[PDB]
RNA sequence: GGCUUUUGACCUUUAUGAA
RNA sequence: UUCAUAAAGGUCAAAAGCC
C-alpha cells in the first residue's frame, strides 16, 4: 500500500518492496552510463584539432552514493575537462561544451547508435550547468535519464579520505565572492559529496531512501516550491549522527526524527568539518558567515559556500506543513496508536 | 538458524580516457 | 603508477525481505 497508510513496523518492508533497487534497474542504468561514458571518452571530443580531453567522468548523485529509488533515480555525471582550468573558466565556458556535447549526441543519434530526448528548458536559465536528457538504446530494455555537467577538476586526482588542500577552497571563495555566485561550483566537488554518503551504514541509506520518497510525495502537492531534496538527505545524516550512530536502529524512529527536525527548521544550523575546517582563516570566515544566515542553515559538507537550506523560508514553511500532517499517519505510530518517539539529539559543538 | 537481495570494504583482471 | 566509467574473479561486513 501507499506510504501514508503504512504502519511503523512495516516501513522496512515498504522500503524493500518499493524503494530498494532491483537487479534489472541498476544493471540497465549502469549499461546506459557505460554508453554515455564511452561516448564522452571515445567519440564526443575527437572532432577538435586541439585535443580537449576528459580526465574523468564521475558518477555522482544517488547513483554514486548508492541511495537510488528503484526505477526513479537518474544518472548524474560530472564530466571533467582538461581545458577548463578554473572556476571562472567553468562559469563562462560550460555552455560551450554543453552545446558541443549536445551536437555530438545528436550526431550519434543520426547514426542509429542510440536515441536522445532533451529536457523541457522552460526557463532560459541564463547559463545552464547541466545537459539533461533521456537515453534510449536497442541494447537497453528501458529509458534512463541523465544530467551531464561539464566541470573544472579543482581537486585533481583525489584520494578518498583526504582533506582537500584548503587553498582550493580559498580560490573557490575568492571567485564566488567576486561574481556573487555562492554554491555555484558544487559539481567540482561531487566526489566529496558522494564520499559523504558512500560508506554509510546500509540502513542509514534505506532511511534516506524513505525520506526521499516522502519528499517526492510532498512534491505532488507543493510542486517545486519545496527546499532542495539534498537538504533532506543531509538532514537525515545529521539526525542519525546526533541520534543513533548505529548500524541497527528503528526506521520509524529515524523517520519521525527527521519530520520533527523539519518542524524546527527555524533553529537548524547544521555543518560538517569533513572536507574543510576553521584552520584556514579565509575558509573559517566563509563558514562563519554562512552560519550567520537566517535559518535553516544546512552547509554542504563538500562546499563551504553552499547553504543547501536554500534561503527560502516559504519552502520550509510548506514542507513543515507536510511534516505536521505526516506525524499523524500510521508511519511513526506503534500498534497501540502511540508515536514511536524521535531520537534524543546530542548537542553538536 | 537457512535462502536471497540491497549497500559498501579489501585484493586482483580487462577495455576505455586522463594525469 | 594513479584517478575515472563499465565488465570479470575472489574475500569480508552491514542491513533488509522471505522461509
Ligand atoms: N542544492 C544543491 N546544492 C549542492 N549540491 C546539490 C544540490 N542539489 C543536488 N546536488 C548534488 O547533485 C546530486 C544529484 O542531484 P539530483 O539528481 O537532483 C537528486 P539525487 O541526490 O541524485 O537523488 P535522486 O536523483 O535519486 O532523486 C545530489 O546527490 C547532490 O550531490
Ligand atoms: N554537484 C553535483 N553533482 C552531481 N550532479 C549535480 C550536481 N549539481 C547538479 N547536479 C545535477 O544537475 C541538475 C541540474 O543542475 P542545476 O542547473 O544546478 C539545478 P537548478 O537549475 O539550480 O534547479 P534547482 O532549483 O532544481 O536546483 C540537478 O538537478 C542535479 O540533478
Ligand atoms: Mg540523481
Ligand atoms: Mg540529476
Ligand atoms: Mg555486490
Ligand atoms: Mg587500464
The residue whose C-alpha atom lies closest to atom 19 belonging to ligand 1 is: A61
Burial label, A244 (beta-carbon count in 10 A; 0-12, 13-18, 19+) = buried
CA of residue A75 to ligand 3 center, whole Å: 6
For residues A129 and A181, state if they share a domain. no
Q: Which CATH number does the domain housing residue A28 bear? A: 3.30.460.10
CA distance A62 to A33: 14
Nearest ligand (C-alpha, residue A65): 1
Atom of ligand 2 nearest to the CA of A149: 12
Whether residues A220 and A276 share a domain: the answer is yes
Identify the domain boundary among A118, A144, A160. Answer: A160
Q: Name the residue among A108, A49, A60 with its Cα closest to residue A83.
A: A49
Structural domain total, chain A:
2
Say whether both A277 and A345 belong to one domain: yes
Same domain, A151 and A168: no
- Kindly report each contact of residues A319-322 with a partner whose C-beta sits within 8 Å and lies 24 or more positions away, as own/partner: A319/A218, A319/A222, A319/A226, A319/A227, A319/A262, A319/A265, A320/A262, A320/A263, A320/A265, A322/A218, A322/A221, A322/A222
Please indicate, yes or no, whether residues A309 and A339 belong to a single structural domain of this protein: yes
Does A283 share its domain with A154?
no
**A282 plus A335 within the same structural domain:** yes
Pair A190, A313 in one domain: yes
Single out the residue in A106, A135, A160 at which a domain terminates. Answer: A160
Query: Closest residue by Cα to the C1' atom of nucleotide B8?
Result: A199
Q: What is the CATH number of the domain that holds A323?
A: 1.10.1410.20
The structure was resolved to a resolution in Å of: 2.0
Residue A140, CB, strand C, below 7 Å: no
Verify if strand C has an atom below 7 Å from the CB of A158.
Answer: yes
Same domain, A286 and A210: yes
A45 in the same domain as A122: yes
Instruction: Give residue A253's domain range.
Output: 161-349
> If residue A167 lies in a helix (H) or strand (E), which one and from where to where?
helix A166-179
User: Distance from the CA of A68 to the center of ligand 5, in angstroms?
Assistant: 15
Strand C nucleotides, any atom under 7 Å from protein beta carbons: they are: 2-7, 13-18
| Ligand 1 center from residue A269 Cα (angstroms) | 20
Q: Whose CA is nearest to atom 9 of ligand 2?
A: A187
Looking at the fold, whether A165 and A151 belong to one and the same domain comes out as no
For residues A189 and A302, the answer to whether their CB atoms sit within 8 Å is yes
Residues A191 and A329 in one domain: yes
Pocket of ligand 2 (CB under 6 A): A 60-61, 76, 78, 125, 128-130, 147, 149, 186-187, 190, 193
Which residue precedes each gap in chain A (C to N above 2.5 Å)?
none
List the determination method: X-ray
Cβ–Cβ < 8 Å for A310, A297: no
Nearest ligand, measured from the Cα of A130: 2
A229 lines ligand 1 (CB under 6 A): yes
Nearest nt to the CA of A46 via C1' is: B17
Which residue's alpha carbon is nearest to atom 5 within ligand 1? A186
DSSP A139-161: S-SS-EEEEEEEE--SS-SPPTT
Helix axes A313-326, A202-222, angle to 10 degrees: 110
d(CA A72, CA A340): 29
Instruction: Work out which ligand 1 atom sits closest to the CA atom of A63.
Output: 22
DSSP A302: T
Domain end, chosen from A108, A132, A160, is at: A160
User: Atom 5 (ligand 2): residue with closest C-alpha?
Assistant: A76
Name, in order, each residue with C-beta under 8 angstroms of A231's C-beta and a sequence gap of 6 or more. A296, A298, A308, A309, A310
Give the DSSP letter of residue A337: S
CA distance A278 to A318: 34
**Cell numbers at residue A47, please?**
572532432
Amino acid at each position: 500500500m501507499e506510504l501514508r497508510h503504512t504502519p511503523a513496523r512495516d516501513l522496512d518492508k515498504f522500503i524493500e518492496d518499493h524503494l530498494l533497487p532491483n537487479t534489472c534497474f541498476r544493471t540497465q542504468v549502469k549499461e546506459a552510463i557505460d554508453i554515455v561514458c564511452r561516448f564522452l571518452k571515445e567519440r564526443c571530443f575527437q572532432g577538435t584539432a586541439d585535443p580537449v580531453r576528459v580526465s574523468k567522468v564521475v558518477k555522482g548523485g544517488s547513483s554514486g552514493k548508492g541511495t537510488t529509488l528503484r526505477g526513479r533515480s537518474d544518472a548524474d555525471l560530472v564530466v571533467f575537462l582538461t581545458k577548463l582550468t578554473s572556476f571562472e573558466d567553468q562559469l563562462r565556458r560550460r555552455g560551450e561544451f554543453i552545446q558541443e556535447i549536445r551536437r555530438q549526441l545528436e550526431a550519434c543519434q543520426r547514426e542509429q547508435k542510440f536515441k536522445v530526448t532533451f529536457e523541457v528548458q522552460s526557463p532560459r536559465r541564463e547559463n545552464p550547468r547541466a545537459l539533461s536528457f533521456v537515453l534510449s538504446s536497442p541494447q537497453l530494455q528501458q529509458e534512463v535519464e541523465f544530467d551531464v555537467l561539464p566541470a573544472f577538476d579543482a581537486l585533481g586526482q583525489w584520494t578518498p579520505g583526504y582533506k582537500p588542500n584548503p587553498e582550493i577552497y580559498v580560490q573557490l571563495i575568492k571567485e564566488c565572492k567576486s561574481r556573487g555566485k555562492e554554491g555555484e561550483f558544487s559539481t567540482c566537488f561531487t566526489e566529496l559529496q558522494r564520499d559523504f554518503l558512500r560508506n554509510r551504514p546500509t540502513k542509514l541509506k534505506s532511511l534516506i531512501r524513505l525520506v526521499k520518497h516522502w519528499y517526492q510525495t510532498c512534491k505532488k502537492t507543493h510542486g517545486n516550491k519545496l527546499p532542495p531534496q539534498y537538504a533532506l538527505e543531509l538532514l537525515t545524516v545529521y539526525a542519525w549522527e546526533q541520534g543513533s550512530r548505529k548500524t541497527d536502529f528503528s526506521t520509524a524512529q529515524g523517520f519521525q526524527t527527521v519530520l520533527e527536525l523539519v518542524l524546527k527548521h527555524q533553529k537548524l544550523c547544521i555543518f560538517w568539518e569533513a572536507y574543510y575546517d576553521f584552520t584556514n582563516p579565509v575558509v573559517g570566515r566563509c563558514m562563519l558567515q554562512q552560519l550567520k544566515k537566517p535559518r535553516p542553515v544546512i552547509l554542504d559538507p563538500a562546499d563551504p559556500t553552499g547553504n543547501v537550506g536554500g534561503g527560502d523560508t516559504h519552502s520550509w514553511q510548506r514542507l513543515a506543513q507536510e511534516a505536521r500532517v505526516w506525524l499523524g499517519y500510521p508511519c511513526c505510530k506503534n500498534l497501540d496508536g502511540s508515536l514511536v518517539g524521535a531520537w534524543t539529539m546530542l548537542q553538536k559543538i
